[PDB]
Amino acid sequence: GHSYEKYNNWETIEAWTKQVTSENPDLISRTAIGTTFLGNNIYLLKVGKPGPNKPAIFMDCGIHAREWISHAFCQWFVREAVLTYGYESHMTEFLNKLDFYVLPVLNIDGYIYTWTKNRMWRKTRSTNAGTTCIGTDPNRNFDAGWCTTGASTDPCDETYCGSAAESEKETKALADFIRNNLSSIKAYLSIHSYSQHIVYPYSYDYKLPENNAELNNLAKAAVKELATLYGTKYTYGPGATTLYLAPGGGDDWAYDQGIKYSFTFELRDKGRYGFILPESQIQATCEETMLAIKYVTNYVLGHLY
Ligand SMILES: CC1(C)[C@@H]2CC[C@@]1(C)[C@@H](NC(=O)[C@H](CC1CCCCC1)NS(=O)(=O)N[C@@H](CCCCN)C(=O)O)C2
Ligand SMILES: [Zn+2]
Ligand SMILES: [Zn+2]
Ligand SMILES: [Zn+2]
Structure with missing residues (x-):
């Protein structure tokens, strides 16, 4: 039994990707872009009204296993697309003009593990040579300042x-997909938790991106929009300046592929519950996050390239 207001296990999310697609065939198609270490299909939903030569926005959730609110958000986004297409001006325009590639759970093996064995697991579930320690951080596994300071060389x-770089099947699948569709993809969005931040490049080094002023202004406006609903306070900026060095991230990698609108969202909360965000907060968190995501989407539509 799937619910948008509860955390769903992988079997349930997987069944949902199939069911939401079949229920909405003129708005959603599903593909598998690869398989995980343990052989699970990595599903991708293409959300939008089909048309010729459409630009796209790519969004992933569940890079990190324990960040359950992220997984919940990708589901919420699809919920909103199907519920409000035809009923709300902006979502209607978005789905007509753009496609959204929504990857609801990247790190499926790790997600399963948080349900079965260890709620606080972060990494993949792949084996490592010379040790019994398991897993790689997919968000340190992309080919962007790969394995410099802020990533560890210790498999434990x-x-x-x-x-x-791209040693993980999951990382390689995502990067291959983006490389294959690069000319259409205009923005990259990666959903995480927690700490209430909107981050943009760079995180692999202390440097500012070519369009720093533009990204600063856009992040500032998105944070402002998010706050309108419940007054939730986000901070923002370049990753290395606002957060910490974190080389090998999908956002920096996508940016250096030429996707100039690239953001990481770290959702609620600020440490009270941390990764173990109560289900009672799913609705409010997803609804306010929708406002930021739609703001960014609208901006991208107005600044195509
Ligand atoms: C294992 C750690 C000690 C190491 C530093 C703190 C950790 C706990 C961990 N960070 C997280 O879990 C954060 C949430 C914590 C942030 C600091 C305050 C407490 C919460 N979530 S995250 O992994 O999704 N952050 C993304 C940002 C990357 C943006 C550019 N790509 C990422 O690092 O890939 C990395
Ligand atoms: Zn994360
Ligand atoms: Zn809503
Ligand atoms: Zn402008």
């Missing part, structure tokens, strides 16, 4: 960069 560490 939570920020382990992996044996090589």
Whole structure:
């Protein structure tokens, strides 16, 4: 039994990707873009009214296993697309003009593990040579300042960069998909938790992006929009300046592919519950996050390139 207001296990999310697609065939198609270490299909939903030569926004959730609110958000986004297409001006315009590639759970093996064995697991579930320590941080596994300071070379560490860039099947599947569709993809959005931040490049080094002023202004406006609903306070800025060095991230990698609107969202809360955000907060968190995501989407539509 799936519910948008509860955390759903992988079997339930997987069944949902199939069912939401079949229920909405003129708005959603589903593909598998690869398989995980343990052989699970990595599903991707293409959300939008089909048309020729459409630009796209790519959004992933569940790079990190324990960040359950992220997984919940990708589901919420699809919920909103199907519920409000035809009923609300902006969502209607968005789905007509753009496609959204929504990857609801990247790190499926890790997600399963948080349901079965260890709620606080972060990494993938792949094995490592010379140790019994398991897993790689997919968000240190992309080929962008790969495995520099802010990632660990120790396979037993939570920020382990992996044996090589894109060593993880999951990372490679995502990067291959974006490389294959690069000319259409205009924005990259990665959903995480917690701490209430909107981050943009760079995180792999202390440097500001070419369009820093534009991204600063856009993040500032998105944070402002988010706050309108419940007064939730987000901070924002370049990743290395606002958060910490975190090389090998999907956002920096996408940016250096030429996707100039690239953001990481770290959702609620600020540490009271942390990763173990109560189900009672799913609705409010997803609804306010929708406002930021739609603001960014509208901006991208107005500044195509
Ligand atoms: C294992 C750690 C000790 C190491 C530093 C703190 C950790 C707990 C962990 N960070 C997290 O879990 C954060 C949430 C914590 C942030 C600090 C305050 C407490 C919460 N979530 S995250 O992994 O999704 N952050 C993304 C940002 C990357 C943006 C550019 N790509 C990422 O790092 O990939 C990394
Ligand atoms: Zn994360
Ligand atoms: Zn809503
Ligand atoms: Zn402008």
